[PDB]
A and B are shown apart, each in its own frame.
With several copies, the nearest count.
Chain A
Amino acid sequence: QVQLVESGGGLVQAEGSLRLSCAASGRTFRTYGMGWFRQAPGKEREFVAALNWSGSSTYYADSVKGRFTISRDNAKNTAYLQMNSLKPEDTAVYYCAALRRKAEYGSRSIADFDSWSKGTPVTV
């Protein structure tokens, strides 16, 4: 029950740094767990990172672990994803979503995230 708008996309150099932001238009952003998904040319959507409502617990994917850090600010009602040492495989469209109040923590499936977003394109 939150509207998510993404920002921070664009073209970056190799082994650069980027910071995507996902802002929520609502007062219930602090009761849902945020997550990010990747859409590359071909194949299908992939899981990138996610965290719970308080931000204490955070889990990434195996291929992106160690370089991407996802956090959130409940005071500003937004979430951030900082990507360091980017690779050409990271060139894709990023989507911001939230757990649908009934999916357990640690879910890595499309059906477990409800409030999607338009997404931003990142080229490396």
Chain B
Amino acid sequence: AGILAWFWNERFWLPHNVTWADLKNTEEATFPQAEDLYLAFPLAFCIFMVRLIFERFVAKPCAIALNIQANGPQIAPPNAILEKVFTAITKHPDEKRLEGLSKQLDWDVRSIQRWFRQRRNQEKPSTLTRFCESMWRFSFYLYVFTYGVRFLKKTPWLWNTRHCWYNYPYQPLTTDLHYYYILELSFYWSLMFSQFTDIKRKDFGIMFLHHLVSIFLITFSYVNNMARVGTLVLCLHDSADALLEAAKMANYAKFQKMCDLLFVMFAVVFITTRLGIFPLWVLNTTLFESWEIVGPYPSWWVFNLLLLLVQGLNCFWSYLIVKIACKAVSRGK
């Protein structure tokens, strides 16, 4: 209990002269509590259960009726040198490596690229399972974005972001905020469950770090009662995730034109909402307005550093997205 009391120092999180005892629930108003986050763990499991049903009785018949092959990817032709290079050298050879392999094996570069793509597909799961997972993600993201838009349409701090900090932290918790935060955290914990235990042959990369950062931000902004700006960030980030899954579903259905159009639109929305609106609208209120309304307290630095890390990760993702979308634009012409 000593270590927990040291971690939850009231002079670190809350502003000056504000104590946790002032945020206790009474009959006058209710405030967010850390214990309310425990409920995110059972519901997450329930969500996972529902996901299985969605992949069993709903997404699978739709994929079958879409002429999606239920078997595994086509087996790449055997090659000792190619297999050794793939296992040891790299999985995505560069132009120089491809030229060297072509010269060594007296084979066309296109054949080597096709073999590498086939090997990568063989390592990756089957197409139908990915289609079902993308369908589930698309449905959830569409519902969450719609709910977030409907909820923020009436809130007073959407139009004037300074209302996020005027009465902070003495801002009562409503049912809509609680439901929104619990739903988001439950979905992220469901993703963590599907990543850790469902199949441990998956990859821990940048996406895993981004998920960890998102979970940390949601948890410690709900605990600290920074939910008004959290909802803005959540809606802004979930705006562009409803088109990526649709583009993936179109790609897995062998619809070239539809997938290209959907991905171009997704890239436009992603760039607009995570490089032009985020730093001028969300990073404005959490850096400048918060400084002049609330004041400098230690948790401000931590949260702003995490937001800058999120901005950097979004820059990296946007770079990859535009690099891929240039090929789609070229093909569309």
Contact = CB atoms under 8 A, between A and B. Distances in A.
Contacts of B293: 56-57
B292 A56 contact: yes
Interface stretch (B166-174, B181-189, B256-264): B166-174
Interface string B160-178: 0001001100101000000
B294 interface: yes
A44 B182 CA distance: 45
B106 interface: no
Contact of A101 (B17, B163, B172, B292): B172
A102 B156 CA distance: 13
Contact of A105 (B22, B29, B167, B294): B167
A30 interface: yes
A82 interface: no
A30 B22 CA distance: 10
Given A30-B17, A54-B15, A74-B17, A101 B170 contact: yes
A57 B292 CA distance: 9
A104 B172 contact: no
B294 A31 contact: no
A39 to B, nearest CB: 26
Interface in A95-111: 99, 101-102, 104-106
Contact of B163 (A31, A56, A105): A105
B166 A102 contact: no
A101 B22 contact: no
Contacts of A54: 15, 294-295
Contacts, number: 37
Contact of B167 (A1, A28, A30, A33): A33
For chain B, the bracket of interface size reads 10 to 19
Nearest to B166: A105
Interface string A27-65: 010111100000000000000000011101100000000
A97 to B, nearest CB: 16
B166 A31 contact: no
For chain A, the bracket of interface size reads 10 to 19
Contacts of A1: 28
User: Helix, strand, loop or mixed for chain A's interface?
Assistant: loop
B102 to A, nearest CB: 68
A106 to B, nearest CB: 8
Interface in A59-77: 74
Q: Which of B22, B163, B170, B292 has the most CB of A within 10 A?
A: B170
A53 B167 contact: yes
Interface string B292-304: 1111000000000
Contact of A56 (B17, B170, B295): B295
Interface string A1-41: 10000000000000000000000000010111100000000
B15 A102 contact: no
Contacts of B17: 30, 74
Contacts of B294: 54, 56
Nearest to A27: B22
22 contacts: A1-B28, A30-B17, A31-B22, A52-B166, A53-B167, A54-B295, A56-B292, A56-B293, A56-B294, A56-B295, A57-B293, A74-B17, A99-B167, A101-B28, A101-B170, A102-B172, A104-B156, A104-B163, A104-B166, A105-B163, A105-B167, A106-B166
Interface of B: 15, 17, 22, 28-29, 156, 163, 166-167, 170, 172, 292-295
Given A31-B170, A99-B167, A101-B29, 18 more contacts: A28-B22, A30-B17, A52-B167, A54-B15, A56-B293, A56-B295, A57-B166, A57-B293, A74-B17, A101-B28, A101-B172, A102-B29, A104-B156, A104-B166, A104-B167, A105-B163, A105-B166, A106-B163
